[PDB]
Amino acid sequence: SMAAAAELSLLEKSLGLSKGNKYSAQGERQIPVLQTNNGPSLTGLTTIAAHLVKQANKEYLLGSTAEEKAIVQQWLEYRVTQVDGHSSKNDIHTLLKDLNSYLEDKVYLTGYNFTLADILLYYGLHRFIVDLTVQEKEKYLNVSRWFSHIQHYPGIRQHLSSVVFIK
Amino acid sequence: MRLFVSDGVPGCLPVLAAAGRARGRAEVLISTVGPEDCVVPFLTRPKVPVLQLDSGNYLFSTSAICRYFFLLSGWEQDDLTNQWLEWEATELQPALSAALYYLVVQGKKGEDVLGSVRRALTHIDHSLSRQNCPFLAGETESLADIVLWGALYPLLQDPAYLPEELSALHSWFQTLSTQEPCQRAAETVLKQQGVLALRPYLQKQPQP
């Protein structure tokens, strides 16, 4: 996995937050911790990510209805339990197959609206997608379409390598 | 909308306890299913519980389902709740999974079970007694409480597995277990058989 500190730095810049925070790391898993000015400390990649989205006055990225909010959090949890964990380690391809089926009829993870879930899933999948062969990217047609769209979404990709897809 | 559950699957515990928050905004149809029925079209392996929404979307994450029921009740998302739920999924769950496996599958007892979750239980106790309040983020039971209770209940229902030094954890747990929607869910999911109902599910799971 991308180090949490680096991913939060990416997210800050993609959100347009001019002042980068300094994060500490807690426990053996190096879980990120944010100390807040005139607020409590926050622990956890997705927990801090949602807080940053709010700091950027972009709360719409967390979803705009009860359903969309739940779906966003489902995919954030998916990122930190399946993509970052053993599920990806042991069988990246069943994960890609399911994600490919899921994205068959959707532009973004929730549907028609871009959310924090697309950002974090893009950052989390990036190490796997860069390693896919040309044939693998043709097989996972929907993941490739979605990934290609996010990697070109204004301000998201930053320093990360572009992946080549066929249109 | 339709909630799919299966006998003795521990994830069904928090979602059933939360399902009442849906009372005003929607009817939740409950469908008791088999533990290897694949209800989600885009998922290869079967997963339960699952919520099939009126929109045709699927929630397959137990915490996301509970979050949805609370949101329907008018609950608002807060950072502390997110923190608890992220910790539950990434830190508590693997520890509980090892413990319940040791307890139910291998017949281990005492510290051979507890050792796996001691750090996580201590964390909850410490947070409950740092703040002066009886609930995790709130002044009344809310989403984090239901989620953590639902995960913990299958182990902590046996008071041998709640360390006496962790008194703050102790009260909170009893307080929640003595709430009607929790009792009912506990009864629905565990069929009043302690942890015995859990064995078929826990045996399909990987050893540590």
UniProtKB/Swiss-Prot annotation, chain A:
CDD domains assigned to the protein according to its UniProt record, in alphabetical order: GST_C_AIMP3 (cd10305)
Coiled coil ranges: 154-167
Modified residues (N-acetylalanine): A3
Domain (GST C-terminal): residue spans on this chain: 51-167
Keyword Acetylation: yes
Region (Linker), start-end ranges: 58-64
GO BP annotation list: cellular response to leukemia inhibitory factor; negative regulation of cell population proliferation; positive regulation of apoptotic process; positive regulation of apoptotic signaling pathway; positive regulation of cellular senescence; positive regulation of DNA damage response, signal transduction by p53 class mediator; translation
Compartments, as annotated in UniProt: Cytoplasm; Cytoplasm, Cytosol; Nucleus
Chain positions covered by the region annotation C-terminal: 65-153
Major subcellular site: cytoplasm
Residues modified as N6-acetyllysine: K139
Induction info: By DNA damaging agents such as UV, adriamycin, actinomycin-D and cisplatin.
Tissue: Down-regulated in various cancer tissues.
A Pfam family per the record: Arc1p_N_like
Entry keyword set: Acetylation, Coiled coil, Cytoplasm, Nucleus, Protein biosynthesis
Keyword Cytoplasm: yes
Function: Positive modulator of ATM response to DNA damage.
Protein name as catalogued: Eukaryotic translation elongation factor 1 epsilon-1
Organism: Homo sapiens
Recorded name of the encoding gene: EEF1E1
Curated annotation (Swiss-Prot), chain B:
Keyword vocabulary terms for this entry: Aminoacyl-tRNA synthetase, ATP-binding, Charcot-Marie-Tooth disease, Cytoplasm, Disease variant, Hereditary spastic paraplegia, Ligase, Neurodegeneration, Neuropathy, Nucleotide-binding, Nucleus, Phosphoprotein, Protein biosynthesis, RNA-binding, tRNA-binding
Single GO biological process annotation from the record: methionyl-tRNA aminoacylation
GO CC entries: aminoacyl-tRNA synthetase multienzyme complex; cytoplasm; cytosol; extracellular exosome; membrane; nucleolus
Domain GST C-terminal, first and last residues per copy: 74-198
Keyword Transmembrane helix: no
Cellular compartments annotated: Cytoplasm, Cytosol; Nucleus, Nucleolus
Keyword Cytoplasm: yes
Quaternary structure annotation from Swiss-Prot or TrEMBL: Monomer. Part of a multisubunit complex that groups tRNA ligases for Arg (RARS1), Asp (DARS1), Gln (QARS1), Ile (IARS1), Leu (LARS1), Lys (KARS1), Met (MARS1) the bifunctional ligase for Glu and Pro (EPRS1) and the auxiliary subunits AIMP1/p43, AIMP2/p38 and EEF1E1/p18. Forms a linear complex that contains MARS1, EEF1E1, EPRS1 and AIMP2 that is at the core of the multisubunit complex.
Protein name as it appears in the record: Methionine--tRNA ligase, cytoplasmic
Source organism of the structure: Homo sapiens
Biological classification of the source: Eukaryota, Metazoa, Chordata, Craniata, Vertebrata
Entire-sequence positions represented here: 1 to 208 of 900
